[PDB]
Amino acid sequence: MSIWKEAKDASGRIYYYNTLTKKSTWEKPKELISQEELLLRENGWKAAKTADGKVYYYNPTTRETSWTIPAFEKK
């Protein structure tokens, strides 16, 4: 549902904070990495990165290119 969130530290450092248990972290937990991957599949999207660490998603069926996971409303 929504157990993790993205916040900025005192120096603007990006860290993922769990509000369900009020815990803090900096590395995306597998459950947070396994969901987006599961939405990708359903529509036919893939995730990859560039030489500059640029994360880009593309659809091998329509040859589409997006710089971020397309919004997937409640199916």
Swiss-Prot record:
Q: Where in this chain does the record put each WW domain?
A: 1-31, 42-72
Subcellular location per the Swiss-Prot or TrEMBL entry: Nucleus
What does the function comment of this entry state?
Answer: Required for pre-spliceosome formation, which is the first step of pre-mRNA splicing. This protein is associated with snRNP U1. Two commitment complexes, CC1 and CC2, have been defined in yeast. CC1 is a basal complex dependent only on the 5' splice site. CC2 is a complex of lower mobility and is dependent on a branchpoint as well as a 5' splice site region. This protein is involved in CC2 formation where it binds to the branchpoint binding protein MSL5, bridging the U1 snRNP-associated 5' splice site and the MSL5-associated branch point 3' intron splice site.
Q: What is known of its domains?
A: The WW and FF domains bind to the phosphorylated carboxy-terminal domain of RPB1.
The subunit structure is: Interacts with CRM1, MSL5, PRP8, and the RNA polymerase II largest subunit (RPB1). MSL5, MUD2 and PRP40 interact to form the commitment complex 2 (CC2), a precursor of mature spliceosomes.
What's the family?
Answer: Belongs to the PRPF40 family.
Annotated protein name in UniProt: Pre-mRNA-processing protein PRP40
- Which organism encodes this protein? Saccharomyces cerevisiae (strain ATCC 204508 / S288c)
The shown residues of the full protein are 1 to 75 of 583
